[PDB]
Amino acid sequence: SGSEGNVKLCSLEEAQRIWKQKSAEIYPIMDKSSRTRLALIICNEEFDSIPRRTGAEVDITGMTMLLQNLGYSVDVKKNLTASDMTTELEAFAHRPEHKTSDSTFLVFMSHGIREGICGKKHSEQVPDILQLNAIFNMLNTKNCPSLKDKPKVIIIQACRGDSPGVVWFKD
Amino acid sequence: AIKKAHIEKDFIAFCSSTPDNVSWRHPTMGSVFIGRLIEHMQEYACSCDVEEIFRKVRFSFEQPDGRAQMPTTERVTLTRCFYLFPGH
C-alpha cells in the first residue's frame, strides 16, 4: 500500500509551509535518492530469571514497520545481555551508512529498574543492567562522529522502578 | 586544521514512565506506550516536530485509568526542530 504504510504523508504544500516558517530552525534532510538511514531495535522478551514479556512481538512488529515507514533500515536484535547490547551499540555506531544519513532512531524494550535496562540474565543477586548514560556515551560526537549534528532519537519501553506512579486526592 | 565540537548534542530520549514508576504492557495488544507512540507518529509526523509529537503522547496519558503512567522526555540537546517530512 506504499512505502510509508499507515503514516500520513507530508504533502509538498505542507512541507513548504513548514520549511520557510522555521527555516533556520529545522534539522536538514538528505536527498531521498541517496541517503542511507539506519535504526536499531533491541528487544528482550525471554529472560533467565525474570517473567517473559508476552506481547513484545507486537511491539517489535509495530516499531519495525513504523521506522521503515519513516525511511529507516531497521536492524532488530533480541534477547541480549547488557554486555551484548554494548557490543551491538558499538557496532551500530561504527556503521558506514551513518555518514550518508541525516538522523537515527534507537529503540530499547525490556524489563527495567531505576538504574536502567535489564539484560536477559538479570537477577537481584547478579544484576545485568545497561544504563541510559552508556547509550548516550556510545552515540555521542566522540564515539559516533558520523552522527555529529544529526538528531539521535532514543525510545525506551521499560519500568523505572516498582511504584505505581500515583497518589490519591479528594474529589 | 582541527576544530572543537560539542561532545553531546542533538539527542532526545523518550521513556515510557517517570523515574521510580512502572510501565504497562498487554500480552495481545503490546506495550501501551509503544502503541500510543506509533499511533501519534502516524497521525502527526506529517505536521509536528518530534518534540511536539512526544508532548502529545504525554498528553494522551494525562488521565490515569487504573494503570497510570506518564512518559517522560529526557536529556534533550536538540538545537533545531526535527521534522520527519514523511514522503520526502
Binding site: 514479556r53 524489563h111 527495567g112 | 512502572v22 510501565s23 504492557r25 498487554h26 494503570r67
Partner: peptide, 4 residues
C-alpha cells in the same frame, strides 16, 4: 495487563 502486566508491568515491565
Amino acid at each position: 495487563f502486566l508491568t515491565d
